[PDB]
Design a protein around this ligand. Sequence first.
Ligand code: NAD
Length: 311
Amino acid sequence: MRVLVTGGAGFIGSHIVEDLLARGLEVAVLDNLATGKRENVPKGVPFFRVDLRDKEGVERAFREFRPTHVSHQAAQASVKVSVEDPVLDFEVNLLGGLNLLEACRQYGVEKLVFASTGGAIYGEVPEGERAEETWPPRPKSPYAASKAAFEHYLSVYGQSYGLKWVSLRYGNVYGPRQDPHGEAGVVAIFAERVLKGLPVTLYARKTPGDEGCVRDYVYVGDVAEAHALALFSLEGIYNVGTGEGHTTREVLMAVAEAAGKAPEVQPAPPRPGDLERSVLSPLKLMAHGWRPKVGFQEGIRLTVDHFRGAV
Ligand SMILES: NC(=O)c1ccc[n+]([C@@H]2O[C@H](COP(=O)([O-])OP(=O)(O)OC[C@H]3O[C@@H](n4cnc5c(N)ncnc54)[C@H](O)[C@@H]3O)[C@@H](O)[C@H]2O)c1
């Protein structure tokens, strides 16, 4: 099996590359380094410094590497950026995505595994409930629209052309090598600021001083494992979440514990157009044997250590 990982120089992408290499697979990376780092790509892994919006460059990567499978992690992956720059989000996530699908058809790729988003696709998840894969998309931002739209394209490419596909709707993915810009960016923000002894802003869920918003935090190593399972054996839509929510206050407490510091917390009103609660139903994926191996406290500890370990 020869796997091309778009966005493989990025946070989730680099963990996927390492995971796949440890399963005897030939792996290549396609990445324009917009946010990814050349240093994240292991020695000996073919690296195509290519923008997915450059059809001729995508074609070159396919010709040179000859992938059998494609893992599509490359994206404009900041909700904020998408609201302030919907055209960039569209060009990268849809136009770039489509160039990739067209190369997949041309080269007879056997499966495309897509990084989708549970947080941005499902909308508000009521108390007591967990978003399930049959819930209808309720996109609120351009990022959500481009991800939802790309899933429609995967479905129509499967139906029309026979391209097999899986859409992994990730929860809030955190861990070593993450930046502060993705859906679980708060983990990096808190880790860096708590370590530096800077005040942290705790945005309210509804009232300044409350516990803050609820998300399904899933450790990046556990996401990489779900990705391998998906690649080998799955088709269709699967949530990749723990099925348990944590509040922003709980994240801060875990970061403080791991850093061994008592941070200065400053409450703020809710950030406008942020979800109060998102928790994903993990049942569909867990029926195929996947479970998080790394608990929340342990994962936060591992993330903090990574931020401590720079020079
Ligand atoms: N909490 C999360 O981090 C989260 C949650 C849900 C879904 N996702 C999705 O997972 C995937 C990976 O996210 P991440 O957190 O690792 O972010 P990331 O920015 O670290 O990784 C994305 C990679 O894509 C590359 N890239 C961006 N635009 C490109 C382009 N036009 N052509 C080629 N490469 C390009 C970047 O350089 C980067 O290395 C994304 O699709 C993202 O939307 C992330």
